[PDB]
């Protein structure tokens, strides 16, 4: 641990809680750096808060574990500590010298290519004031109520300017991570995010990657940033058109945990395209926040009390960084390019040890690199590539030496590619091509019903009040109307929830967490008008812009595929539920107020 970088932060958060400060000798941290602890109040729950409207309108699914076990997440310090020990407290072996050399070459080439048409720039306060939504989770004595309140206050910006001057003077006294673990059942994730000011420093330093769409498909060829779930299927099919082998959608087991010091090292190469003051700011953010970081994580202690530990690490990646998605997409693009080169025999096994003829890597990149980029869609850690042949399946040496081991696959077993582009997983979804009554085609996202309903049953706990629950249920219903209309039960639940919730209201937020959920369903506008605007009017893949007439004219996808993706039609409880849908919607209209429109 380089104490000259994190020492001031450690001492400040120690002086914040000096009465209970102590150095535990029984900490379970093996790969991180322990610096002390202090008693803190317990937080979270053994299970998430369940929405009332969803549970009462999804009576049959109360029995299937697919929508119940998803809400059985314990954010208690015991579960957080277990998730930390299993998922985060790991150590990635450093890649070999030739591997790091190839990584550096490909990363420099990609940073130059993404900057052939773009130039890094500063990010002002006004941009950040816009992007903030109705987090402001503070970590030190200067605390607020919400982010929209703190962002409009001058004392917050003065407190941020102080830390900016510290970054300019080579010090750092406020940018501290706060880790919240989440245990499932499975896919238990840890969440990092600093307070609003540290994230604004991140923003002003590096947010041009997001605001200027540096990872957009136009400028990156392989990225998909900006596109909603209503266009990624088109991207996948246009990839399917190109020649080559199968399409591969491998997933990295704990991608954030596997990013090495060399990944951050090669991502910091973008500092060579920034102006000197911008370079000072961004290098400060990188070396005081990304390559050296202190986190605060709760851990159960004796006597029922919970104790927060102050921990430190260098070579990993957090979750709630302002630009974590862009850098993840960049590193994944580099990974896929390296694996493509290994598949095409450009990169052999001896180049792992020490790259003898580096020109072979550059020449390829200049002759073929961009093409390979067009044959891939990368959204952060998720990716789908279409190589020139199926050798990609067994090009694993450079992938494993970089530590990007594949999820749910033996280390040295060839990957499995999808021959049907309508079955490939991308952003937790597959994409199906269905036809309207006009014979016109529409590629549309779809996923399993159980997860789609369980994610609709949860509540953040800050929306405990009934009004919040009702508005969030309307949000989920209209999201289904826009994105999952092709599903029978989701169409029924949407037309039921929108009829149970008062029409004049506005939906809450949080339907999905993927950057591809643009949120066109957060409006009181007629949902058929929104559907036509998204799928026909503003759809660049729809030529004949003739509109539709009503949801009765909207095509469900085939019954067989629906049943395969978790549908329940034909089930006796499902049919009784559909029959008593009127009874249940009217009984749900009650205990609220108001149901001013009947959508059935």
């Amino acid at each position: 641990p380089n104490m000259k970088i994190i020492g001031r932060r450690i001492e400040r958060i120690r002086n914040e809680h000096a009465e209970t400060w102590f150095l535990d000798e029984n900490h379970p941290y093996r790969t991180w750096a322990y610096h002390g602890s202090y008693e803190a109040p317990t937080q979270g729950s053994a299970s998430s808060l369940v929405n009332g409207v969803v549970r009462l309108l999804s009576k049959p699914w109360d029995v299937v574990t697919g929508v119940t076990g998803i809400a059985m997440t314990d954010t208690t310090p015991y579960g957080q500590q277990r998730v930390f020990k299993e998922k985060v407290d790991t150590r990635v072996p450093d890649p070999q010298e030739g591997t790091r050399q190839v990584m550096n070459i490909v990363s420099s080439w990609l940073w130059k290519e993404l900057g052939k048409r773009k130039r890094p720039r500063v990010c002002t306060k006004e941009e950040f004031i816009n992007k903030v939504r109705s987090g402001a989770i503070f970590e030190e004595e200067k605390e607020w109520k919400t982010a929209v309140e703190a962002v409009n206050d001058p004392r917050f910006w003065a407190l941020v300017d102080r830390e900016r001057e510290h970054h300019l003077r080579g010090e750092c006294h406020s940018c501290v991570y706060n880790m919240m673990g989440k245990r499932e059942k499975k896919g238990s994730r840890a969440i990092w995010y600093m307070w609003l000011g540290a994230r604004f420093l991140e923003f002003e330093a590096l947010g041009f990657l997001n605001e200027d769409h540096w990872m957009g498909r136009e400028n990156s060829g392989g990225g998909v940033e900006g596109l909603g779930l209503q266009r990624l299927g088109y991207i996948l099919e246009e990839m399917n058109r190109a020649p080559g082998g199968k399409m591969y959608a491998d997933d990295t087991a704990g991608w954030d945990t596997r990013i090495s010091k060399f990944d951050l090292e090669n991502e910091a190469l973008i500092t060579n395209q920034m102006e000197e003051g911008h370079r000072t700011l961004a290098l400060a953010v990188i070396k005081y926040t990304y390559q050296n970081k202190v986190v605060k994580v709760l851990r159960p202690a004796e006597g029922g009390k919970t104790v927060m530990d102050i921990i430190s690490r260098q070579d990993q990646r957090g979750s709630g960084q302002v630009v974590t998605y862009a850098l993840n997409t960049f590193t994944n693009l580099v990974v896929q390019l390296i694996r493509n080169m290994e598949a095409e025999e450009v990169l052999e096994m001896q180049d792992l040890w020490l790259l003898r003829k580096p020109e072979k890597v550059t020449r390829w990149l200049q002759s073929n690199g961009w093409d390979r980029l067009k044959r891939m869609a990368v959204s952060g850690d998720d990716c789908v590539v279409k190589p020139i042949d199926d050798r990609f399946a067994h090009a694993l040496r450079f992938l494993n030496d970089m530590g990007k081991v594949r999820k749910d696959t033996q280390e040295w077993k060839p990957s499995t590619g999808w021959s049907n582009w309508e079955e490939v997983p991308f952003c937790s979804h597959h994409f199906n091509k269905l036809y309207l009554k006009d014979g016109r085609s529409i590629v549309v996202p779809c996923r399993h019903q159980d997860e789609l309903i369980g994610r609709a049953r949860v509540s953040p706990g800050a929306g405990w009040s009934i009004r919040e629950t009702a508005c969030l249920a309307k949000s989920y219903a209209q999201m289904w109307q826009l994105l999952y209309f092709h599903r029978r039960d989701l169409r029924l639940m949407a037309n039921a929830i929108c009829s149970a919730v008062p029409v004049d209201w506005v939906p809450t937020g949080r339907t999905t967490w993927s950057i591809h959920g643009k949120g066109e369903w957060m409006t009181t506008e007629d949902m058929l008008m929104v559907w036509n605007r998204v799928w026909i009017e503003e759809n660049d893949h729809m030529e004949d812009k003739t509109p539709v007439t009503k949801w009765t004219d909207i095509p469900y996808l085939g019954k067989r595929e629906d049943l395969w993706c978790g549908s329940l039609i034909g089930h006796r409880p499902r049919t009784t539920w559909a029959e008593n849908i009127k009874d249940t919607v009217n009984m749900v209209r009650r205990i609220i107020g108001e149901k001013y429109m009947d959508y059935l």
Binding site: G44, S45, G52, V63, A71, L568, H571, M587, I591
Partner: protein, 619 residues
Amino acid sequence: SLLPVDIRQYLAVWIEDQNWQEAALGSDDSKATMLFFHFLDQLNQDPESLLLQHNLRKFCRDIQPFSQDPTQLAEMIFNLLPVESQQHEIESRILDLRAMMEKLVKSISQLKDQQDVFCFRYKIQAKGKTPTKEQKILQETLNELDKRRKEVLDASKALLGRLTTLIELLLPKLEEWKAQQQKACIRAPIDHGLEQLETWFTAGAKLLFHLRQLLKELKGLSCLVQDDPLTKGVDLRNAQVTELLQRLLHRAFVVETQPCMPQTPHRPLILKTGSKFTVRTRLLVRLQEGNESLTVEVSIDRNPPQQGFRKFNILTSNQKTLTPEKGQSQGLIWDFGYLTLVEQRSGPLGVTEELHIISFTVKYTYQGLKQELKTDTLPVVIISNMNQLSIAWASVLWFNLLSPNLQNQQFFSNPPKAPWSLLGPALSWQFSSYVGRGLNSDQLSMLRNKLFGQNCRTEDPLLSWADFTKRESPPGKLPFWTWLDKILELVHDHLKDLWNDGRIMGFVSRSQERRLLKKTMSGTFLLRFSESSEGGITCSWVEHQDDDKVLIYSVQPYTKEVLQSLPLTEIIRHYQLLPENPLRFLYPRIPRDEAFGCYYQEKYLKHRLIVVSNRQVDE
């Protein structure tokens, strides 16, 4: 309280105003979830007093898992809303396991639906043309089903334990009631009834049969589509519930009303040949199939002693049939009237000293469960003529007061002695039941002196059976029991109202009579029962004629032969001895016309004398 719900006082109005009991469960979980939402809405002085403001938050998170089972939170709110305490324990345990039964029914109802969704989603996967990762998700929900059914088995076992404890409490209560009925037959003043035991036994039986039904439903569901151990577990639970059901139904069949001739309601268990009698059996498990009637069959002396013991058969019929409608109207009861007994034309114990036992058998059936229930009455004595009715009753008492074993027909071949602590209160019970008043300590001590003597230095003396029925009482020509029984008959037939209002001393010794009549005015008289004549009341008044003399006159005892045509109140009213009435005051100091005036209706004898010298008594 182990569960954490602190400072209920802040939102006390809210919690107190709430509908927790209604939200405990119901047709719609929606009311419980509404209580949840508005409860949270509510959950939203000095800061030192607002320290619990943080504690609130903890609770507000602790009940977050209750948003999955809202009836659980509403149930927390609703449940949080001495000689015989065993009754309360019985009723509370019954209510507890009824609530547990509702919870188990809900568990089964949702497990059936989970197995149905498993089949509905396994059909599709089997119809898939690929016959692999989603197969393991299907196996995961299968493992969830396995855990759920293990939980159901554990819940059934937890129900079986409490039901076993309930039966182990219920059966001793029934045996206590049997002993109390045994005492009540021999005229003890006990108010009882099988209604409460009926409710208890019937609750237990209803819940046992309900569990027996749920196990079958479970097994049929469990197979889905004997590979699962749920078959073996359900079979074991079913064997156990059937064992408990048989153990309960074994004793659920009892004799509600012992056999008693209607001619003599006061004295049960004495039966004359040819005279019909009335028995009544009751099945405490008020569960009857609405399509089939229940028939009880009667027998006499199933295990007769193998000794000069007379045989007896039943005239007319030995059956009572109960249709389900009547069984609903009056409960599962078979009331035998018109039951007559007749000897089969073909030792040291007398005719009234041999005992007979009347048995009853039913073939009970409910929800497929069949069992033969058998029960028999208290032992009975069969007389040839009503002139035995008295002495035969002495056989009933002596048994029902001292027989440990009720299956002992050889009781009088070696009869035990009756202690006074038991016999005295029984002699009181006889009068108490048959006539208005019982026997107080003075008359009881008089009878004790008459039976054992004033010398007896043993506490609670033992009276021989021979000294109670066969040995004569010294002062008269009648054994003790026959004499006291004729006194009881005399009181009931000719002295009922006099004995009720306490105008009769009844049982005073001659010496105690003199001692009481010494220190009183001339003209004071007692009414005492004659120890020499059979069923006779005598009157004795004292007179002082000299400074040293105290004469005690007495009348020749009045029997039924005189009191049938001339009541005693009229004799006291007009004694007219040669001619002023010598009966001036009733003891202690009540005017003769005042103590008997209310019995006087609008519109000879012989005397005896015993002289008490004042000074020779004063020595």
